């Protein structure tokens, strides 16, 4: 099952304020109008970074596991958002075949769609907007945590009903920061020859 993620998954590239300006930036991003895999348990590739979104009714999805083989003899990131504490750690877990020691890091901190952008050292962005299945609308993601862990990672799994997975790719985006210093639009410079023109002219309007 696939869904067209229209213009979602733009995030602030750097911890720098800018306003009323069209900054052009190269980073891993979710490509515009990409197919996102709509799940309803399965261990997935990560490749470059995962955009993840859910219209979770009652906090049904709660967490993630990331690594290479999700067993001992390698390290694996765990995240659990248990409403008491955002538990994070990178232990060499001997996990089960389908879950729902030697630890080297630890940390604590319907209408809504939760969004995240997991990328590598390890960074998480977030946004949390009401809607009424991804919206034909636009909103930036803000950094949420930025945690140094030094982990080789290529696979992930999810802990618990819809969740949408998209894979990031290296791209150049042009981002319109408004007067309040928030991104109101973006252009994916790889999308089509019009977008290649919009980035060439550094403009959303091409004469």
């Amino acid at each position: 099952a696939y869904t067209n993620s229209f213009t979602r998954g733009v995030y602030y590239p750097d911890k720098v304020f800018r306003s009323s300006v069209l900054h052009s930036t190269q980073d891993l991003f979710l490509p515009f109008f990409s197919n996102v895999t709509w799940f309803h348990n399965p261990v997935l590739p990560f490749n470059d970074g995962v955009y993840f979104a859910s219209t979770e009714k009652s906090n049904i999805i709660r967490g993630w596991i990331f690594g290479t083989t999700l067993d001992s003899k390698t390290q694996s990131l765990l995240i659990v958002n248990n409403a008491t504490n955002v538990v994070i750690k990178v232990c060499e877990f001997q996990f089960c075949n389908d879950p729902f020691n030697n630890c080297t890091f630890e940390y604590v901190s319907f209408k809504n769609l939760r969004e995240f952008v997991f990328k590598n050292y390890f960074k998480i962005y977030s946004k949390h907007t009401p809607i009424n299945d991804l919206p034909q609308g636009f909103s930036a993601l803000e950094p949420l945590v930025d945690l140094p862990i030094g982990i080789n990672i290529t696979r992930f799994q999810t802990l618990l009903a819809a969740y949408y997975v998209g894979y990031l790719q290296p791209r150049t985006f042009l981002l319109k920061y408004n007067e309040n210093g928030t991104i109101t639009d973006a252009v994916d410079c790889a999308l089509d020859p019009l977008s290649e023109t919009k980035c060439t002219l550094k403009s959303f309007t091409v004469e």
């Binding site: 602030y12 750097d14 911890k15 304020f17 009323s20 210093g181």
Partner: protein, 383 residues
Amino acid sequence: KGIYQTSNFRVQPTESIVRFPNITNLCPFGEVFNATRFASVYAWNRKRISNCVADYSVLYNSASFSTFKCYGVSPTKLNDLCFTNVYADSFVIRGDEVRQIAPGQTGKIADYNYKLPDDFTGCVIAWNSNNLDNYNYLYRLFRKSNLKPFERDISTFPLQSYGFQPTNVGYQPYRVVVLSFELLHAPATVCGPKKSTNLVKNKCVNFNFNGLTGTGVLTESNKKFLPFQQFGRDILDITDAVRDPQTLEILDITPCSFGGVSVITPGTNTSNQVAVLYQDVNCTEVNVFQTRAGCLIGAEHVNNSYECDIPIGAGICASYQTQSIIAYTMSLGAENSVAYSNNSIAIPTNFTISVTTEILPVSMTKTSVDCTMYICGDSTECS
């Protein structure tokens, strides 16, 4: 007679201001440089260091280090810098091999055990350990390709051991530490021990926030930073605002008042009195007059208008007259309402056969330059 741009004026900084975050815990460098065990180079150890204060003078002042070679900072500057991550890498190698631990080298160490980037920004710190540390220390010989910068590789036969017995000088075990400073544009977390000092507003000052140096007038601003943003950039990509690291307030940075200075003079055969124009500044930042070109000192303003003499700009001209220099809005010429009506004509009854000189350049002085004799005059070794 004329106006001459002579020099740039620039208001000087009144104070030095350093702001670093209010952290007081000394970094765990003793737990690296004085550690009892150092790892075998093929599986070189990494410890990251953050959220602490690092006195590099405690390292650098010791002669116990045989080398302290730094490749993107000079060691006397370290205590005034601040960094995101330090990344201390630690291992043992043969003493005569220590010269391979540098940006851009080739050899059994730099190609297959531990590679630094060709733009490594850090310090390599090394010492003899024959008084302490033997086949127990290992290195790689063979690989299918060279390893990437800061790659680490455990695999299986391609490993060998060193012969570090106490009777062996280049054959001795040298302990090596590399510090690999992350100069990233982010909230920094390892500063040198240099003291913070009180905030100063609306005065020109030499500022340093988290190691970002400059000079400017700090002013508190209504720029709506999101909680994660550390500093802001202008439309010209220069730093335009910053957040104070010891209290989260958004300070705009304005560069201290500057401008071209131009001197307005009659001919020196006529007088030595002159008037000074400070271009593009209000008359507060410097018998004083004000113009859209800048603040004008020593020329008196006049309500009459005359033909232009020395042009200032923005409709103002200056002259020397009954004496002082005066500045005035220039006359475009005498006013004349023409005596038009729907049945009036004026016809010349008499004429003048005036002669009027016009001068034009027609040629340049025909120069030829011998490019070989200009560049390499009388020299085979240069030619």
